[PDB]
Amino acid sequence: RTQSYTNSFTRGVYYPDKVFRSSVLHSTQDLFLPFFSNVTWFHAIHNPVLPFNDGVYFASTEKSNIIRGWIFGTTLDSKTQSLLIVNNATNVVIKVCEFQFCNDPFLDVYYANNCTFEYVSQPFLMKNLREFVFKNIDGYFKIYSKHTPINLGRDLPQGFSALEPLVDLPIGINITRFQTLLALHAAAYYVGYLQPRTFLLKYNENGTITDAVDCALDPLSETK
Amino acid sequence: TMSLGAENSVAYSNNSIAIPTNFTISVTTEILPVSMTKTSVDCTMYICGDSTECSNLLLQYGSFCTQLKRALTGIAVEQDKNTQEVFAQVKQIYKTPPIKYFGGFNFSQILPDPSKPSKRSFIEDLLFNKVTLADAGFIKQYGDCLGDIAARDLICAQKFNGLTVLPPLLTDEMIAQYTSALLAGTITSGWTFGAGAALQIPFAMQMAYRFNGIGVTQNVLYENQKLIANQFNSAIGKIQDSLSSTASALGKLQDVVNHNAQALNTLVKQLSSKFGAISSVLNDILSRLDKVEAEVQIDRLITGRLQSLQTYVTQQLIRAAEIRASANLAATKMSECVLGQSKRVD
Amino acid sequence: STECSNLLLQYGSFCTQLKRALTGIAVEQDKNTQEVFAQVKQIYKTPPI
Amino acid sequence: AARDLICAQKFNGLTVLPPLLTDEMIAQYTSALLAGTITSGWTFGAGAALQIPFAMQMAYRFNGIGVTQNVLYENQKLIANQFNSAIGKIQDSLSSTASALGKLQDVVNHNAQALNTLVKQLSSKFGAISSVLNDILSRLDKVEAEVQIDRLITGRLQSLQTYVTQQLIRAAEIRASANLAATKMSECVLGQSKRVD
Amino acid sequence: CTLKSFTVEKGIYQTSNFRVQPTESIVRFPNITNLCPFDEVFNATRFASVYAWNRKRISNCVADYSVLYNFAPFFAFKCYGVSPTKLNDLCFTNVYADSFVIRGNEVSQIAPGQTGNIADYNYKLPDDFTGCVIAWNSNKLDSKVGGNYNYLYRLFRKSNLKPFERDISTEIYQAGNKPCNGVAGFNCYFPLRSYGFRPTYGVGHQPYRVVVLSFELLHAPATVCGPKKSTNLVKNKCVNFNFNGLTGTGVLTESNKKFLPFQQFGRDIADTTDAVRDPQTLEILDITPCSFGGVSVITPGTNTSNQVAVLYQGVNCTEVPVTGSNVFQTRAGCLIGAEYVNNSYECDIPIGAGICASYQTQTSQSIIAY
Ligand SMILES: *[C@@H]1O[C@H](CO)[C@@H](O[C@@H]2O[C@H](CO)[C@@H](O)[C@H](O)[C@H]2NC(C)=O)[C@H](O)[C@H]1NC(C)=O
Ligand SMILES: *[C@@H]1O[C@H](CO)[C@@H](O[C@@H]2O[C@H](CO)[C@@H](O)[C@H](O)[C@H]2NC(C)=O)[C@H](O)[C@H]1NC(C)=O
Ligand SMILES: *[C@@H]1O[C@H](CO)[C@@H](O[C@@H]2O[C@H](CO)[C@@H](O)[C@H](O)[C@H]2NC(C)=O)[C@H](O)[C@H]1NC(C)=O
Ligand SMILES: *[C@@H]1O[C@H](CO)[C@@H](O)[C@H](O)[C@H]1NC(C)=O
Ligand SMILES: *[C@@H]1O[C@H](CO)[C@@H](O)[C@H](O)[C@H]1NC(C)=O
Ligand SMILES: *[C@@H]1O[C@H](CO)[C@@H](O)[C@H](O)[C@H]1NC(C)=O
Ligand SMILES: *[C@@H]1O[C@H](CO)[C@@H](O)[C@H](O)[C@H]1NC(C)=O
Ligand SMILES: *[C@@H]1O[C@H](CO)[C@@H](O)[C@H](O)[C@H]1NC(C)=O
Ligand SMILES: *[C@@H]1O[C@H](CO)[C@@H](O)[C@H](O)[C@H]1NC(C)=O
Ligand SMILES: *[C@@H]1O[C@H](CO)[C@@H](O)[C@H](O)[C@H]1NC(C)=O
Ligand SMILES: *[C@@H]1O[C@H](CO)[C@@H](O)[C@H](O)[C@H]1NC(C)=O
Ligand SMILES: *[C@@H]1O[C@H](CO)[C@@H](O)[C@H](O)[C@H]1NC(C)=O
């Protein structure tokens, strides 16, 4: 893989709770991605295991849908239960079954162990930037997602797009390492780490978070 | 480092004097707060809000609610007294004659305009537009809040939580009638309407009286009447232009509005605090817990909300005392500046 | 103390409105001095004699 | 060795802000007012400064109080001697008696003792087992220590609210006095007053 | 009665306010039909050890919490955040039942904010816990002569436990400088030690079976709700409502709030519920408190007359829940008992917005407003 560092540009804001508020400025304190943070752009062409530190913000502008899932865990072997999310052309499947994958896990397009959880749903993935936030809180693997019509693939847009929670999985496993999945018969994705931050969220009349202020970014935002 | 002012050295000597050879007429503006918003608080609905258990636990805390209501009622009466003693200083509602010739002086931007529904002058309309004053829920705030609007209002939240704004006794039309009567009496009689019955006198003669009052011979006015009238008209036009462009001159009245809005907003936001309880929702407490533990949590909430209400009442009492001092100053200025000519410097 | 701070965060905005009142007092002190003393527009000085 | 109370006040979060105008600036304002009065009379307060001899200004003041000019112009030396003697008497009285500025001494002492009481109120228990938060946290566990910390928080918050309320009332009184002083500067200093006493 | 006097002076006095009373009650719970399997939790042959405590997820069933007294012989039902009596009224999203067996000395360690060997290495409860702990003696089940070494607990660990975190690894704990490398000797300790349970020990060392029921106060749709039946939906009427254990009183109106599909409740500035989602039919309802307002009594002196007018402050005259035949609409409220006259006098008893009332002649004495 090839690593290039870049800026967040006020990305990664999500809905902190399932409560409707409209035309109000609400102060929340949670694991957020700080504004103008240092995110890493990975280029993988046909792969060390990445850390999972206080949640991961993941982003991809790949229209080819080569990226098709995630693997989470501690050691990613048969000894430790490893979560696996796989998105094929019909559904999405989430399983805690460990496959005992190799050091470079991938999927073959051209035509196990202990199993305690399984969840099947509709495809997460349909010039379109897809954003996800994964965080483990109190034995919950909370996932937030968003889709955005992007203009430039290389350029992370300057704007706001609140992430909405997809699922609330009570997996309750110890996660410190993770990796992505590629489909083989090229890929480029952005990874960032969340931190405990206090945010000021602005709701419009429709209850949508249209703006946010990071209180600890600089003295001006602290004054705000 | 801040600059105190330009340096000056008066050319003083024991056989030299400086005497002016010309003059100018200045029209300055002084803004004084008189009365603030009259408010009333339903302590039972604020603290408990339709909860019999909370009300019965509140009954054991004595006469705190009654004395808070008494203090707020005293403030509300004091505001009307301030407005009455400031504006209602003329016994008869004078009106100006249909003719509008006062020796070249205009008095067109301060005399009322009958075309508008409220008989307020141009400058009064400019002031009312420049002060961003809320309606304060006068005309049926609950009926307005009953309309299903997707955006909840802060006034609606205050009304639902039990903080009500009472309307003033004297309407703005009545205040404008007082000011119009005072203006007409001043223009048509001078100071004589402040010490008995109004005595008519031409405005040139009245200004000659004023000139003799400030120690200047009246022939100065009778020989510079046109220049003085032009200077007065230009100063009035400059007042109009300053009011129609800069909106920061009314900061005192804007602060009077803002403080009374912010106090109610803080009092409403203080209902979401826990004060060491398990929840800030009384019905949630009563549904989760049994009698004794619910009583303990409700007592914690009651103590917190009672302390918040007492803080609000104390702050309003101090603010009302300050406003009363300002209103007394405004009444004295109406008695001496308007009803007569003042020899007091500055 | 972090435990005391977390317990104090449950008491609302008393802890900030006292600060607001004190700031108002501190501003009006300088307002009082400004009104009492700075009434003249220019700094006059007496002749040397 | 002599432990200051101001260090305890600072260490407990009670600081004092400096005034905006320095004493040099206050003295410059007073010098400007005094020089303008001496060299022009009330004219500098009514508009631009107009120079006039001091004897003639005294004659204007005498006509203001209702005494003709010849009284001054024939008793000028006597009046100057009386004014100089009065100034010397004021200087001697201020050098001798140290209890003249009782109002300003009270202005200092009220704030000093209010801060001292606020600092000393930290030693009370308010019903808890100890007045030391670290001692409470080291002795009791979380559940049994939260109640004592709540007691201490409530007591200290009540004390701080009492301090703020008393300071607000004192500030209102001081503002009334400052308005009176501004009126006295406008009327007594910048002109001649006909108001009795 | 308000003035605590038998003589009332002339004027207007603020008397106690008025409320529009609710008509009936509405209960609205989700449509579920199953029963929660507490038999598998309580009537079990063997509970797992504390270091490997069993966890069961309970969802999509009707929970009857007064039935649990028959399954196990325990004295009390200790709960943090809730009360055992009210458990059948409010209902939760998910329930989690944890099961293990400990000693009698370590029962007090199963509580929020508690530290110790068990609470630090085997089972740690969150400090914001909202649920119940059940413990009962099992000396006749978990004790055998010569020792029942089938129960284990952890004595050694490098770090503590996060809330609701389970450790299963059996690795050689190294208490010294030299590595152990799979050899238990000297300062190389096996962390798992066995409870030696004998029937001849005292009651303090006897085994105790513990079941912890943790409730979830989430904002997701509730799946575990009690046996309380649900009624029909009444709108545009002042009624009491009970939505998924959320009790209140007000008027439910059809709303146009654009709720996102994951949002259930809506909140106000004062953190009170403003819009709810009906669990049976997924529609959004606004909640508005029933009509209220101030009440003032306008009277002359009791030395003169006993006739009284009443001003309803903040109420439109068409919205009065109910009283003389003279109803007048003022900008301050609705005045009942004073007939408005077209004349104008000095202000005798002020009301607001330029209105004053007085006891005056008509022909013959009555209260007039002008
Ligand atoms: C006193 O000042 C006024 C200005 O306020 C002078 O009036 C101006 O006179 C000049 C020259 O005669 C004209 O061009 C201006 O149009 C006048 N202004 C106004 C507003 O009328 C007046 O001349 C001055 N008096 C003396 C004696 O110099
Ligand atoms: C008094 O002032 C008013 C307002 O400036 C004058 O009325 C205006 O007069 C001008 C011409 O002098 C007209 O073009 C405007 O249409 C008038 N109305 C307004 C609203 O500007 C009035 O003439 C002045 N009267 C005197 C005696 O000076
Ligand atoms: C008016 O009083 C002043 C003092 O207040 C008198 O001036 C004093 O006169 C005596 C005798 O001539 C001198 O010894 C003093 O030194 C003077 N005092 C001062 C301060 O100069 C003055 O004589 C009195 N005038 C009349 C007419 O009695
Ligand atoms: C992110 O960190 C790397 C670490 O070397 C640095 O090179 C890069 O400039 C950083 N990105 C920024 C500051 O935007
Ligand atoms: C996607 O995977 C699921 C997993 O069971 C399977 O049922 C489904 O048929 C798959 N869809 C495809 C391969 O298009
Ligand atoms: C699956 O679970 C069984 C039951 O404990 C266990 O014996 C087996 O080793 C597990 N298989 C794995 C973890 O691959
Ligand atoms: C809410 O959305 C509608 C249509 O989606 C839009 O017309 C309206 O302006 C929005 N409200 C805002 C932005 O406050
Ligand atoms: C008057 O002033 C002049 C110069 O300003 C000075 O020379 C003269 O001494 C003064 N008169 C007296 C009596 O000192
Ligand atoms: C519960 O009743 C509602 C109302 O008729 C209905 O829409 C829903 O399908 C029912 N649920 C079940 C599981 O039958
Ligand atoms: C517990 O429930 C089971 C049902 O399988 C029953 O057989 C048993 O008698 C009950 N009581 C005990 C003490 O096991
Ligand atoms: C869980 O992960 C954390 C990560 O720091 C680690 O400290 C802890 O020992 C792990 N616990 C278990 C039981 O694996
Ligand atoms: C009172 O209700 C009537 C009828 O609904 C309405 O027309 C009126 O505007 C309301 N308010 C007042 C002050 O009459």
PDB file of C-alpha atoms in Angstrom, chain E residues 35-223:
ATOM      1  CA  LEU E  35     -43.256 -14.623  26.715  1.00  0.00           C
ATOM      2  CA  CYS E  36     -39.783 -13.961  28.077  1.00  0.00           C
ATOM      3  CA  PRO E  37     -37.916 -17.202  28.971  1.00  0.00           C
ATOM      4  CA  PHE E  38     -36.928 -16.696  32.599  1.00  0.00           C
ATOM      5  CA  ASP E  39     -37.260 -20.443  33.215  1.00  0.00           C
ATOM      6  CA  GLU E  40     -34.015 -21.065  31.328  1.00  0.00           C
ATOM      7  CA  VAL E  41     -32.347 -18.326  33.385  1.00  0.00           C
ATOM      8  CA  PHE E  42     -33.473 -19.374  36.867  1.00  0.00           C
ATOM      9  CA  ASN E  43     -34.365 -23.096  36.758  1.00  0.00           C
ATOM     10  CA  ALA E  44     -31.000 -24.259  35.438  1.00  0.00           C
ATOM     11  CA  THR E  45     -29.036 -27.328  36.481  1.00  0.00           C
ATOM     12  CA  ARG E  46     -25.646 -25.577  36.596  1.00  0.00           C
ATOM     13  CA  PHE E  47     -24.651 -21.923  36.489  1.00  0.00           C
ATOM     14  CA  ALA E  48     -21.331 -21.075  34.886  1.00  0.00           C
ATOM     15  CA  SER E  49     -18.369 -19.816  36.884  1.00  0.00           C
ATOM     16  CA  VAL E  50     -17.915 -16.131  37.658  1.00  0.00           C
ATOM     17  CA  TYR E  51     -14.903 -15.797  35.341  1.00  0.00           C
ATOM     18  CA  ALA E  52     -17.041 -17.240  32.503  1.00  0.00           C
ATOM     19  CA  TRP E  53     -20.414 -15.806  33.487  1.00  0.00           C
ATOM     20  CA  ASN E  54     -23.306 -16.745  31.215  1.00  0.00           C
ATOM     21  CA  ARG E  55     -25.120 -14.025  29.264  1.00  0.00           C
ATOM     22  CA  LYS E  56     -28.580 -14.247  27.690  1.00  0.00           C
ATOM     23  CA  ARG E  57     -30.288 -11.621  25.534  1.00  0.00           C
ATOM     24  CA  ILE E  58     -34.028 -11.131  26.104  1.00  0.00           C
ATOM     25  CA  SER E  59     -36.003  -9.299  23.420  1.00  0.00           C
ATOM     26  CA  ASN E  60     -39.396  -9.333  21.686  1.00  0.00           C
ATOM     27  CA  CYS E  61     -41.414 -10.790  24.552  1.00  0.00           C
ATOM     28  CA  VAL E  62     -43.834  -9.816  27.311  1.00  0.00           C
ATOM     29  CA  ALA E  63     -42.060  -9.768  30.675  1.00  0.00           C
ATOM     30  CA  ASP E  64     -43.962 -10.420  33.913  1.00  0.00           C
ATOM     31  CA  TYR E  65     -41.569  -9.513  36.717  1.00  0.00           C
ATOM     32  CA  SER E  66     -43.839 -10.592  39.588  1.00  0.00           C
ATOM     33  CA  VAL E  67     -43.492 -14.224  38.464  1.00  0.00           C
ATOM     34  CA  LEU E  68     -39.761 -14.374  39.295  1.00  0.00           C
ATOM     35  CA  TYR E  69     -40.460 -14.854  43.016  1.00  0.00           C
ATOM     36  CA  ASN E  70     -41.677 -18.419  42.444  1.00  0.00           C
ATOM     37  CA  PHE E  71     -38.590 -19.559  40.523  1.00  0.00           C
ATOM     38  CA  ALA E  72     -35.903 -18.812  43.110  1.00  0.00           C
ATOM     39  CA  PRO E  73     -36.100 -18.513  46.934  1.00  0.00           C
ATOM     40  CA  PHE E  74     -34.550 -15.093  47.546  1.00  0.00           C
ATOM     41  CA  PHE E  75     -35.520 -12.444  50.079  1.00  0.00           C
ATOM     42  CA  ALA E  76     -35.463  -9.129  48.220  1.00  0.00           C
ATOM     43  CA  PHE E  77     -35.155  -7.766  44.679  1.00  0.00           C
ATOM     44  CA  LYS E  78     -32.334  -5.221  44.785  1.00  0.00           C
ATOM     45  CA  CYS E  79     -32.462  -2.679  41.958  1.00  0.00           C
ATOM     46  CA  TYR E  80     -30.521   0.435  40.948  1.00  0.00           C
ATOM     47  CA  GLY E  81     -32.352   3.042  38.875  1.00  0.00           C
ATOM     48  CA  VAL E  82     -35.738   1.293  38.940  1.00  0.00           C
ATOM     49  CA  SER E  83     -37.972  -0.308  41.560  1.00  0.00           C
ATOM     50  CA  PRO E  84     -39.156  -3.942  41.547  1.00  0.00           C
ATOM     51  CA  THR E  85     -42.761  -2.832  42.076  1.00  0.00           C
ATOM     52  CA  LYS E  86     -42.975  -0.577  39.006  1.00  0.00           C
ATOM     53  CA  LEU E  87     -41.223  -2.971  36.601  1.00  0.00           C
ATOM     54  CA  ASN E  88     -44.547  -4.026  35.052  1.00  0.00           C
ATOM     55  CA  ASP E  89     -45.483  -0.439  34.075  1.00  0.00           C
ATOM     56  CA  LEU E  90     -42.496   0.909  32.147  1.00  0.00           C
ATOM     57  CA  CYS E  91     -40.962  -1.233  29.429  1.00  0.00           C
ATOM     58  CA  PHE E  92     -37.485  -1.408  27.937  1.00  0.00           C
ATOM     59  CA  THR E  93     -35.844  -2.053  24.571  1.00  0.00           C
ATOM     60  CA  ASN E  94     -33.606  -5.014  25.462  1.00  0.00           C
ATOM     61  CA  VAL E  95     -32.934  -7.038  28.608  1.00  0.00           C
ATOM     62  CA  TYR E  96     -29.684  -8.824  29.456  1.00  0.00           C
ATOM     63  CA  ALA E  97     -29.570 -11.646  32.010  1.00  0.00           C
ATOM     64  CA  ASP E  98     -26.151 -12.554  33.409  1.00  0.00           C
ATOM     65  CA  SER E  99     -25.734 -15.661  35.556  1.00  0.00           C
ATOM     66  CA  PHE E 100     -22.889 -16.860  37.767  1.00  0.00           C
ATOM     67  CA  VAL E 101     -22.068 -18.371  41.168  1.00  0.00           C
ATOM     68  CA  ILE E 102     -19.920 -16.624  43.776  1.00  0.00           C
ATOM     69  CA  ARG E 103     -19.110 -16.790  47.485  1.00  0.00           C
ATOM     70  CA  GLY E 104     -21.126 -15.143  50.232  1.00  0.00           C
ATOM     71  CA  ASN E 105     -18.388 -12.593  50.906  1.00  0.00           C
ATOM     72  CA  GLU E 106     -18.343 -11.422  47.270  1.00  0.00           C
ATOM     73  CA  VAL E 107     -22.066 -10.691  46.892  1.00  0.00           C
ATOM     74  CA  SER E 108     -21.491  -7.064  47.911  1.00  0.00           C
ATOM     75  CA  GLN E 109     -18.933  -6.658  45.107  1.00  0.00           C
ATOM     76  CA  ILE E 110     -21.673  -7.060  42.460  1.00  0.00           C
ATOM     77  CA  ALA E 111     -22.773  -3.424  42.543  1.00  0.00           C
ATOM     78  CA  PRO E 112     -21.928  -0.215  40.664  1.00  0.00           C
ATOM     79  CA  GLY E 113     -18.989   1.708  42.059  1.00  0.00           C
ATOM     80  CA  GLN E 114     -17.616  -1.321  43.918  1.00  0.00           C
ATOM     81  CA  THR E 115     -14.025  -2.550  43.736  1.00  0.00           C
ATOM     82  CA  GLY E 116     -12.484  -5.831  44.801  1.00  0.00           C
ATOM     83  CA  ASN E 117     -11.150  -9.122  43.523  1.00  0.00           C
ATOM     84  CA  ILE E 118     -14.364 -10.196  41.782  1.00  0.00           C
ATOM     85  CA  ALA E 119     -15.311  -6.698  40.612  1.00  0.00           C
ATOM     86  CA  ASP E 120     -11.775  -6.171  39.269  1.00  0.00           C
ATOM     87  CA  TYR E 121     -10.881  -9.487  37.610  1.00  0.00           C
ATOM     88  CA  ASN E 122     -14.127 -11.422  37.024  1.00  0.00           C
ATOM     89  CA  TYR E 123     -17.221  -9.229  36.611  1.00  0.00           C
ATOM     90  CA  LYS E 124     -17.317  -5.418  36.554  1.00  0.00           C
ATOM     91  CA  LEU E 125     -20.621  -3.492  36.608  1.00  0.00           C
ATOM     92  CA  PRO E 126     -20.978  -0.033  35.031  1.00  0.00           C
ATOM     93  CA  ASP E 127     -21.237   3.002  37.276  1.00  0.00           C
ATOM     94  CA  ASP E 128     -24.387   4.112  35.395  1.00  0.00           C
ATOM     95  CA  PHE E 129     -26.059   0.743  35.948  1.00  0.00           C
ATOM     96  CA  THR E 130     -29.860   0.561  35.658  1.00  0.00           C
ATOM     97  CA  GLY E 131     -31.059  -2.901  36.604  1.00  0.00           C
ATOM     98  CA  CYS E 132     -31.533  -5.487  39.313  1.00  0.00           C
ATOM     99  CA  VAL E 133     -29.272  -7.978  41.086  1.00  0.00           C
ATOM    100  CA  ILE E 134     -30.693 -11.235  42.466  1.00  0.00           C
ATOM    101  CA  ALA E 135     -28.675 -13.444  44.804  1.00  0.00           C
ATOM    102  CA  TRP E 136     -29.825 -16.565  46.619  1.00  0.00           C
ATOM    103  CA  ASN E 137     -28.075 -19.272  48.606  1.00  0.00           C
ATOM    104  CA  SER E 138     -27.342 -22.548  46.816  1.00  0.00           C
ATOM    105  CA  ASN E 139     -25.724 -24.609  49.568  1.00  0.00           C
ATOM    106  CA  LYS E 140     -27.921 -27.602  48.674  1.00  0.00           C
ATOM    107  CA  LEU E 141     -27.011 -27.439  44.964  1.00  0.00           C
ATOM    108  CA  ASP E 142     -23.474 -26.076  44.493  1.00  0.00           C
ATOM    109  CA  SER E 143     -21.860 -27.757  47.525  1.00  0.00           C
ATOM    110  CA  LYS E 144     -20.602 -31.322  47.882  1.00  0.00           C
ATOM    111  CA  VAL E 145     -18.655 -33.199  50.534  1.00  0.00           C
ATOM    112  CA  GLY E 146     -14.939 -32.945  49.817  1.00  0.00           C
ATOM    113  CA  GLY E 147     -15.256 -29.793  47.713  1.00  0.00           C
ATOM    114  CA  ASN E 148     -17.011 -28.766  44.492  1.00  0.00           C
ATOM    115  CA  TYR E 149     -14.075 -27.644  42.344  1.00  0.00           C
ATOM    116  CA  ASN E 150     -16.220 -27.106  39.232  1.00  0.00           C
ATOM    117  CA  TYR E 151     -16.435 -23.355  39.966  1.00  0.00           C
ATOM    118  CA  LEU E 152     -13.462 -21.113  39.204  1.00  0.00           C
ATOM    119  CA  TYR E 153     -12.492 -17.480  39.686  1.00  0.00           C
ATOM    120  CA  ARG E 154      -9.617 -15.275  38.561  1.00  0.00           C
ATOM    121  CA  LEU E 155      -7.093 -13.984  41.103  1.00  0.00           C
ATOM    122  CA  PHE E 156      -4.371 -12.572  38.828  1.00  0.00           C
ATOM    123  CA  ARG E 157      -4.588 -10.167  35.898  1.00  0.00           C
ATOM    124  CA  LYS E 158      -2.311  -7.453  34.546  1.00  0.00           C
ATOM    125  CA  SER E 159      -5.143  -4.899  34.323  1.00  0.00           C
ATOM    126  CA  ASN E 160      -8.715  -4.461  35.531  1.00  0.00           C
ATOM    127  CA  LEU E 161     -11.979  -5.149  33.677  1.00  0.00           C
ATOM    128  CA  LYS E 162     -14.074  -2.747  31.652  1.00  0.00           C
ATOM    129  CA  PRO E 163     -17.809  -2.767  32.440  1.00  0.00           C
ATOM    130  CA  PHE E 164     -19.544  -5.869  31.059  1.00  0.00           C
ATOM    131  CA  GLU E 165     -16.240  -7.327  29.840  1.00  0.00           C
ATOM    132  CA  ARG E 166     -15.509 -11.060  29.979  1.00  0.00           C
ATOM    133  CA  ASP E 167     -12.073 -12.685  30.189  1.00  0.00           C
ATOM    134  CA  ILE E 168     -11.624 -16.321  29.153  1.00  0.00           C
ATOM    135  CA  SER E 169      -7.885 -16.692  28.474  1.00  0.00           C
ATOM    136  CA  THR E 170      -6.017 -19.050  30.815  1.00  0.00           C
ATOM    137  CA  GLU E 171      -2.410 -17.890  30.487  1.00  0.00           C
ATOM    138  CA  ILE E 172       0.407 -18.134  33.008  1.00  0.00           C
ATOM    139  CA  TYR E 173       0.460 -14.899  34.994  1.00  0.00           C
ATOM    140  CA  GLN E 174       3.994 -13.547  35.431  1.00  0.00           C
ATOM    141  CA  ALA E 175       4.470 -11.868  38.814  1.00  0.00           C
ATOM    142  CA  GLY E 176       8.258 -11.605  38.490  1.00  0.00           C
ATOM    143  CA  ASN E 177      11.068 -10.482  36.200  1.00  0.00           C
ATOM    144  CA  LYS E 178      11.781 -13.845  34.575  1.00  0.00           C
ATOM    145  CA  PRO E 179       9.332 -14.985  31.871  1.00  0.00           C
ATOM    146  CA  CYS E 180       7.124 -17.980  32.601  1.00  0.00           C
ATOM    147  CA  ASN E 181       6.823 -19.408  29.059  1.00  0.00           C
ATOM    148  CA  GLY E 182       4.063 -21.823  30.035  1.00  0.00           C
ATOM    149  CA  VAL E 183       5.661 -23.100  33.263  1.00  0.00           C
ATOM    150  CA  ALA E 184       3.831 -22.457  36.542  1.00  0.00           C
ATOM    151  CA  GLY E 185       6.497 -22.158  39.224  1.00  0.00           C
ATOM    152  CA  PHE E 186       7.648 -19.758  41.965  1.00  0.00           C
ATOM    153  CA  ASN E 187       6.335 -16.344  40.784  1.00  0.00           C
ATOM    154  CA  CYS E 188       4.427 -17.844  37.842  1.00  0.00           C
ATOM    155  CA  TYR E 189       0.816 -18.124  38.967  1.00  0.00           C
ATOM    156  CA  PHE E 190      -2.157 -19.830  37.379  1.00  0.00           C
ATOM    157  CA  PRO E 191      -4.885 -17.151  37.492  1.00  0.00           C
ATOM    158  CA  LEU E 192      -7.822 -19.571  37.769  1.00  0.00           C
ATOM    159  CA  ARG E 193      -8.460 -20.899  41.281  1.00  0.00           C
ATOM    160  CA  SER E 194     -11.287 -23.180  42.379  1.00  0.00           C
ATOM    161  CA  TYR E 195     -13.912 -22.451  45.005  1.00  0.00           C
ATOM    162  CA  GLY E 196     -13.637 -25.206  47.570  1.00  0.00           C
ATOM    163  CA  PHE E 197     -17.278 -25.506  48.604  1.00  0.00           C
ATOM    164  CA  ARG E 198     -18.087 -27.694  51.601  1.00  0.00           C
ATOM    165  CA  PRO E 199     -21.450 -28.143  53.348  1.00  0.00           C
ATOM    166  CA  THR E 200     -19.629 -27.810  56.691  1.00  0.00           C
ATOM    167  CA  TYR E 201     -18.378 -24.258  56.123  1.00  0.00           C
ATOM    168  CA  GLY E 202     -20.095 -21.254  57.622  1.00  0.00           C
ATOM    169  CA  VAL E 203     -22.850 -19.320  55.913  1.00  0.00           C
ATOM    170  CA  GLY E 204     -20.353 -16.647  54.846  1.00  0.00           C
ATOM    171  CA  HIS E 205     -18.443 -19.090  52.622  1.00  0.00           C
ATOM    172  CA  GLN E 206     -21.507 -20.821  51.169  1.00  0.00           C
ATOM    173  CA  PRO E 207     -22.133 -20.598  47.409  1.00  0.00           C
ATOM    174  CA  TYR E 208     -24.585 -18.009  46.115  1.00  0.00           C
ATOM    175  CA  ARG E 209     -26.280 -17.991  42.713  1.00  0.00           C
ATOM    176  CA  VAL E 210     -26.457 -14.500  41.197  1.00  0.00           C
ATOM    177  CA  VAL E 211     -28.550 -13.310  38.241  1.00  0.00           C
ATOM    178  CA  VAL E 212     -28.152  -9.710  37.054  1.00  0.00           C
ATOM    179  CA  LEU E 213     -30.966  -8.288  34.916  1.00  0.00           C
ATOM    180  CA  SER E 214     -29.736  -5.209  33.038  1.00  0.00           C
ATOM    181  CA  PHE E 215     -32.353  -3.015  31.350  1.00  0.00           C
ATOM    182  CA  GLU E 216     -31.797  -0.774  28.327  1.00  0.00           C
ATOM    183  CA  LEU E 217     -33.200   2.772  28.325  1.00  0.00           C
ATOM    184  CA  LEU E 218     -32.446   3.352  24.663  1.00  0.00           C
ATOM    185  CA  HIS E 219     -34.456   5.377  22.153  1.00  0.00           C
ATOM    186  CA  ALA E 220     -34.881   2.463  19.752  1.00  0.00           C
ATOM    187  CA  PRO E 221     -38.341   0.868  19.521  1.00  0.00           C
ATOM    188  CA  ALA E 222     -39.108  -1.166  22.624  1.00  0.00           C
ATOM    189  CA  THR E 223     -39.228  -4.950  22.272  1.00  0.00           C
TER     190      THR E 223
END
